[PDB]
Structures are given as structure tokens and as C-alpha cells.
Amino acid sequence: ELTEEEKFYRNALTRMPDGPVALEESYSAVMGIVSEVE
Amino acid sequence: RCNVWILDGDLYHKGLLKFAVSAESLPETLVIFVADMSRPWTVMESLQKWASVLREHIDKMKIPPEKMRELERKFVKDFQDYMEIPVLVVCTKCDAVSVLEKEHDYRDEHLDFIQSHLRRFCLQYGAALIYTSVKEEKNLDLLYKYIVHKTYGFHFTTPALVVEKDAVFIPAGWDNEKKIAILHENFTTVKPEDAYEDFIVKPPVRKLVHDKELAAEDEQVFLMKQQSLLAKQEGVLASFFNSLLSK
Numbered sequence: 001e002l003t004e005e006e007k008f009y010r011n012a013l014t015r016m017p018d019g020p021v022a023l024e025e026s027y028s029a030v031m032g033i034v035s036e037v038e
Numbered sequence: 039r040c041n042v043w044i045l046d047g048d049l050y051h052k053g054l055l056k057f058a059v060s061a062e063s064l065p066e067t068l069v070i071f072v073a074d075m076s077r078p079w080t081v082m083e084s085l086q087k088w089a090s091v092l093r094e095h096i097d098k099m100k101i102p103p104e105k106m107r108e109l110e111r112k113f114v115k116d117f118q119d120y121m122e123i124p125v126l127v128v129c130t131k132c133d134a135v136s137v138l139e140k141e142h143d144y145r146d147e148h149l150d151f152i153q154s155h156l157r158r159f160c161l162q163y164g165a166a167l168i169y170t171s172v173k174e175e176k177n178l179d180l181l182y183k184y185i186v187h188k189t190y191g192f193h194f195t196t197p198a199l200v201v202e203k204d205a206v207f208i209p210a211g212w213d214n215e216k217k218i219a220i221l222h223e224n225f226t227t228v229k230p231e232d233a234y235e236d237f238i239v240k241p242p243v244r245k246l247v248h249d250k251e252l253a254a255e256d257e258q259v260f261l262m263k264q265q266s267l268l269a270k271q272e273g274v275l276a277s278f279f280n281s282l283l284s285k
Contacts, residue, residue: 014050027057 040189055095065109068189069125076134078152079240085159117164120211122197124188125165127156128181132204133171149203150221151228151237157213166210176205184209
């Protein structure tokens with residue numbers, strides 16, 4: 001049996017060269033726009 | 039509308055928690071911890087993992103100690119005042135108990151073991167335990183009612199159900215060591231103090247063990263070896279026939 005992890009590159013998110021920093025900026029930017037609209 | 043934040047299972051994204059809960063939004067937040075009953079053996083390991091992660095997250099928040107103790111006093115006042123921050127343990131895929139009976143030879147003693155473990159953990163963290171099955175749509179309305187009650191302060195009326203194996207529900211404050219002792223009566227082989235792992239075993243899943251790397255010899259060592267080579271140049275049948283020979 002092949003799991004979801006083996007089927008697809010779900011783990012590629014953890015292989016970003018700059019660590020999880022870029023993912024935080026994506027979430028932060030969504031928080032920034034929502035903060036202004038709210 | 040209640041904000042919903044689902045964190046990915048890997049700790050690599052645990053730092054995202056700062057965007058799910060802030061100091062201003064902490065008291066309004068209700069914490070939900072998922073327990074997979076299709077994989078019961080990791081349930082407490084996962085629970086101490088994620089609860090410890092939450093404790094570490096609250097550490098980085100730097101709440102004033104007076105405010106933290108105020109929150110503790112509010113929560114405990116909500117706790118002892120119960121009559122017949124918040125943490126709610128929700129069990130998912132409890133219908134997989136039906137698998138545990140057929141694939142791992144489980145019985146009521148094992149289920150009593152795991153649910154007594156879960157209730158002792160809930161006592162440790164002062165949480166409310168509930169069993170659900172999205173496949174069978176069990177306790178979903180009960181869940182929704184309890185969530186709305188504990189977040190918005192709405193009323194709640196459902197009692198504690200602790201007899202059925204796969205539909206247990208325990209609101210906060212109901213459980214106690216004396217009340218948990220009822221399940222220990224059913225035990226006939228294990229004890230309450232026995233380790234989780236020894237009794238309930240993590241199966242050794244038969245992962246494809248990749249074979250050893252077969253490597254061709256280097257040409258130089260191979261030719262050196264070849265130079266070295268060149269220069270130096272039934273019972274049970276017998277048991278039956280003895281049995282019919284002794285007589």
C-alpha cells in the first residue's frame with residue numbers, strides 16, 4: 001500500500017531553502033489584508 | 039461565526055500557531071485535540087505531543103503572571119462549578135473499534151484500558167472527552183452543541199455517557215479517579231498503572247525493506263583477486279515403524 005505521502009510531494013513544503021520563512025510571509029500577508037478590511 | 043484553525047500534523051508548521059492564536063484572542067479560543075481511533079496506539083503519545091506544543095506556544099506569548107493566574111482561576115471556577123483555556127478531546131473514526139475486534143483480537147478490557155487512559159489524561163488537563171464517527175454521524179450534534187456552549191456560553195443539557203464503548207461522552211468536571219475506577223473492575227489481565235505500550239502494541243507494519251545494495255567490485259581489486267587466484271593455482275515414519283515394532 002502506498003500512502004498519500006508516497007504518492008505525491010506533500011513533503012516538498014518542508015524542503016524550502018529558506019526554511020518555513022516564506023510560508024509565514026504568505027500566511028502573514030493574508031492576515032495583513034484581513035486586518036485592514038476588518 | 040467561530041474561527042477554525044487546523045494545524046498540519048508535522049511540527050515543521052507548528053510555528054504557524056502564532057497566526058491562529060494571539061494574546062487578545064486566547065481567551066475567546068477553544069482548543070480541540072483530535073485522537074485517531076483507527077490508530078489507537080499513538081493516541082496518548084500524540085496527545086502529550088500536541089498538548090506540550092500548546093504549552094510551549096503559550097510560553098512564548100509572555101502573558102503577565104497575574105493575568106495567567108486569573109485565567110487559571112476562571113477556568114477552575116468553571117471546572118468545579120459543574121453540576122449534572124478550555125480543552126476538548128474529540129475522538130475520530132471510533133467506528134474503527136469494529137476493526138480492532140477483528141484484526142487485533144481486542145476486547146472490552148482493551149477498550150476500557152484506552153478510554154480509562156483518555157479520561158485520566160482529560161483529568162490531567164481538565165478536558166471533556168467525546169467519541170464521534172463521521173462515517174456513522176455519531177455525536178456530531180452533541181459535539182456542535184457542546185462547542186457552542188463552551189465558546190458562546192450557550193446552555194447545555196446532555197448527560198455523561200460512559201457505558202457504550204464507541205460513543206463515550208464526558209463533559210468537563212464529570213470525571214474523577216473514583217469515577218474512573220469503575221473501568222478497572224472490568225480488568226482481568228491488566229492494571230490501571232501498567233504502561234500503555236506494553237499492553238496495547240504498535241503493530242510492526244510490513245514496510246518494503248529495500249534490499250542491500252549489491253555493488254560490483256572495482257576493476258583493480260577484482261583483477262588483484264584474480265591474480266591471487268591464478269598465481270596460487272521421514273523421522274515420523276521411522277517413529278511409527280518403531281511403535282509398530284515394540285509391540
